[PDB]
Design an enzyme around this catalytic site. Structure first.
Site, mmCIF file in Angstrom:
data_model
loop_
_atom_site.group_PDB
_atom_site.id
_atom_site.type_symbol
_atom_site.label_atom_id
_atom_site.label_comp_id
_atom_site.label_asym_id
_atom_site.label_seq_id
_atom_site.Cartn_x
_atom_site.Cartn_y
_atom_site.Cartn_z
ATOM 1 N N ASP A 35 40.948 -45.157 -46.520
ATOM 2 C CA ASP A 35 42.035 -44.292 -46.051
ATOM 3 C C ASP A 35 42.565 -44.699 -44.673
ATOM 4 O OD1 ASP A 35 43.833 -42.196 -45.828
ATOM 5 O OD2 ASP A 35 42.330 -40.793 -45.071
ATOM 6 N N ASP A 220 49.699 -45.125 -45.096
ATOM 7 C CA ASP A 220 48.600 -44.227 -45.451
ATOM 8 C C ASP A 220 48.039 -44.531 -46.850
ATOM 9 O OD1 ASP A 220 46.962 -42.064 -46.126
ATOM 10 O OD2 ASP A 220 48.219 -40.610 -45.073
HETATM 11 C C1 LIG Z 1 45.205 -34.859 -55.090
HETATM 12 C C2 LIG Z 1 46.022 -35.848 -54.197
HETATM 13 O O1 LIG Z 1 45.072 -36.600 -53.389
HETATM 14 C C3 LIG Z 1 44.739 -37.905 -53.899
HETATM 15 C C4 LIG Z 1 43.969 -38.668 -52.784
HETATM 16 O O2 LIG Z 1 42.729 -37.987 -52.465
HETATM 17 C C5 LIG Z 1 42.511 -37.471 -51.191
HETATM 18 C C6 LIG Z 1 42.918 -38.173 -50.034
HETATM 19 C C7 LIG Z 1 42.699 -37.634 -48.751
HETATM 20 C C8 LIG Z 1 43.179 -38.423 -47.522
HETATM 21 C C9 LIG Z 1 44.505 -37.837 -46.917
HETATM 22 C C10 LIG Z 1 45.612 -37.618 -48.005
HETATM 23 S S1 LIG Z 1 46.919 -36.567 -47.363
HETATM 24 O O3 LIG Z 1 47.978 -36.461 -48.341
HETATM 25 O O4 LIG Z 1 46.325 -35.337 -46.862
HETATM 26 C C11 LIG Z 1 47.497 -37.586 -46.001
HETATM 27 C C12 LIG Z 1 46.317 -37.976 -45.054
HETATM 28 N N1 LIG Z 1 46.794 -38.709 -43.846
HETATM 29 C C13 LIG Z 1 47.719 -38.072 -42.867
HETATM 30 C C14 LIG Z 1 47.116 -36.754 -42.341
HETATM 31 C C15 LIG Z 1 47.695 -35.492 -42.641
HETATM 32 C C16 LIG Z 1 47.092 -34.320 -42.125
HETATM 33 C C17 LIG Z 1 45.931 -34.411 -41.321
HETATM 34 C C18 LIG Z 1 45.322 -35.660 -40.999
HETATM 35 C C19 LIG Z 1 44.037 -35.792 -40.111
HETATM 36 C C20 LIG Z 1 42.816 -36.282 -40.960
HETATM 37 C C21 LIG Z 1 44.293 -36.829 -38.977
HETATM 38 C C22 LIG Z 1 43.568 -34.472 -39.405
HETATM 39 C C23 LIG Z 1 45.959 -36.818 -41.537
HETATM 40 C C24 LIG Z 1 45.097 -38.671 -45.739
HETATM 41 O O5 LIG Z 1 44.113 -38.856 -44.707
HETATM 42 C C25 LIG Z 1 42.071 -36.369 -48.616
HETATM 43 C C26 LIG Z 1 41.660 -35.664 -49.770
HETATM 44 F F1 LIG Z 1 41.078 -34.477 -49.633
HETATM 45 C C27 LIG Z 1 41.891 -36.201 -51.063
HETATM 46 N N2 LIG Z 1 41.497 -35.526 -52.170
HETATM 47 C C28 LIG Z 1 43.564 -40.103 -53.230
HETATM 48 F F2 LIG Z 1 42.676 -40.028 -54.247
HETATM 49 F F3 LIG Z 1 42.951 -40.724 -52.200
HETATM 50 F F4 LIG Z 1 44.647 -40.844 -53.585
#
Ligand SMILES: CCOC[C@@H](Oc1cc(C[C@@H]2CS(=O)(=O)C[C@H](NCc3cccc(C(C)(C)C)c3)[C@H]2O)cc(F)c1N)C(F)(F)F
Length: 377
Positions: A35, A220
């Site tokens: 990630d 991302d």
């Molecule tokens: C079901 C769809 O998911 C598939 C997806 O599964 C997940 C993936 C993630 C990582 C997230 C996915 S997101 O859409 O939430 C964007 C985020 N990056 C930007 C972001 C937004 C908000 C907060 C933060 C922090 C960590 C800096 C605080 C970071 C990422 O890291 C957390 C989860 F739980 C799940 N399951 C996958 F399977 F990987 F494709």
């Protein structure tokens, strides 16, 4: 020695790409989601309905409790747990072992995915967005500090169930064709970049380019879709609707809810436009573009009936936290996260996506004036 890391990623469509790792002594094997959108290394450390295995701290002689709690709220999903350190290795990665921070996940809510085959997450972004705060050193920073591994990694995420490569410490030239084109990392927290122009089937969207990066644009790998700020999403959907208006789809489709199907092999790819994102380049008034095909933003999903159709979901969705260039943008590109030189490189991937009469591309140079004004403040 990068050949050992080729094809070290697996995954299921819509469920991310994971790499195998071991934690603890003796080593416990877990699959870990890669990630670039976060900065915490966290693993399941307690039983959960969707976990088939998890980190057992009591079985590791090298585990150290940091006696501090932690939680991370993602856009979708959150977990909480306990901070500690332990020895970590990547079997199909560099031949090193490092002591890294590890969040042991004790409770979670919509974090783990049923059947995803991963049990943890490897946040590869910078300390600035680590929880509880930026004093918790991210895994890759530990790796670079404790070993001779160069401060960069590259990701080749491949579409159709899926595979890919995370090359740790370098670039493997057998994984892409053509030239690498680099865009500056605007600020080291997310992998933040600046989009300077958007075209759909060669037509400029004609928005103030600040709208493209409101309130940020990031690369991302943990996110499935291309996500676009509301105003940009609306304009893009309008243009894509118009271009495909030969056929009509339910509004649920454009909202990413309903899937659409066609008879196997009859998917009307040509009625869907190509999307070009222009990124800020390395020299004055210079940019380049990456072009995305419908084969990327129409994500293949399992048949809902007992038939042999080809079904898809619209993998572009609205965002309230800026542009997110997720896996469907990265797929078919070789993406170099050159932390050492604060830049991200794009090249056409060796597993590039296929179309009969069109091709995904990375092209330049282009001239674009006033690119600095595209950044949102
Ligand atoms: C079901 C769809 O998911 C598939 C997806 O599964 C997940 C993936 C993630 C990582 C997230 C996915 S997101 O859409 O939430 C964007 C985020 N990056 C930007 C972001 C937004 C908000 C907060 C933060 C922090 C960590 C800096 C605080 C970071 C990422 O890291 C957390 C989860 F739980 C799940 N399951 C996958 F399977 F990987 F494709």
């Amino acid at each position: 020695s990068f050949v050992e890391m080729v094809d070290n990623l697996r995954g299921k469509s819509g469920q991310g790409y994971y790499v195998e790792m071991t934690v603890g002594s003796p080593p416990q094997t877990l699959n870990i989601l890669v990630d670039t959108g976060s900065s915490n290394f966290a693993v399941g450390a307690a039983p959960h309905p969707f976990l088939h295995r998890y980190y057992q701290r009591q079985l590791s002689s090298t585990y150290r409790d940091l006696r501090k709690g932690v939680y991370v709220p993602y856009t979708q999903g959150k977990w909480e747990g306990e901070l500690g350190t332990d020895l970590v290795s990547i079997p199909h990665g560099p031949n090193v072992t490092v002591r890294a921070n590890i969040a042991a996940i004790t409770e979670s809510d919509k974090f783990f995915i049923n059947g995803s085959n991963w049990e943890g997450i490897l946040g590869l972004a910078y300390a600035e967005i680590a929880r509880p705060d930026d004093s918790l050193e991210p895994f890759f920073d530990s790796l670079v500090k404790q070993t001779h591994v160069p401060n960069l990694f590259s990701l080749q995420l491949c579409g159709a169930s899926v595979g890919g490569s995370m090359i740790i410490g370098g670039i493997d030239h057998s994984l892409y064709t053509g030239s690498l084109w680099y865009t500056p990392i605007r600020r080291e927290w997310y992998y933040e970049v600046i989009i300077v122009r958007v075209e759909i089937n060669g037509q400029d969207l004609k928005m103030d380019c600040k709208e493209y990066n409101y309130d940020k644009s990031i690369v991302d790998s943990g996110t499935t879709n291309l996500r676009l700020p509301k105003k940009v999403f609306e304009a893009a959907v309008k243009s894509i609707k118009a271009a495909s208006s030969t056929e009509k789809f339910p509004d649920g489709f454009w909202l990413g809810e309903q899937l659409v199907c066609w008879q196997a092999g009859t998917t009307p790819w040509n009625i869907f436009p190509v999307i070009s994102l222009y990124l800020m380049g390395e020299v004055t008034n210079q940019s380049f573009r990456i072009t995305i095909l419908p084969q990327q933003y129409l994500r293949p999903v399992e048949d809902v009936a007992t038939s042999q159709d080809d079904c898809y979901k619209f993998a572009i969705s609205q965002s309230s936290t800026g542009t997110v260039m997720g896996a469907v943008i990265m797929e078919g590109f070789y993406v170099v996260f050159d932390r050492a030189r604060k830049r991200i490189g794009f090249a056409v991937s060796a597993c590039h996506v296929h179309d009969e009469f069109r091709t995904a591309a990375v092209e330049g140079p282009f001239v674009t004036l006033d690119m600095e004004d595209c950044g949102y403040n």
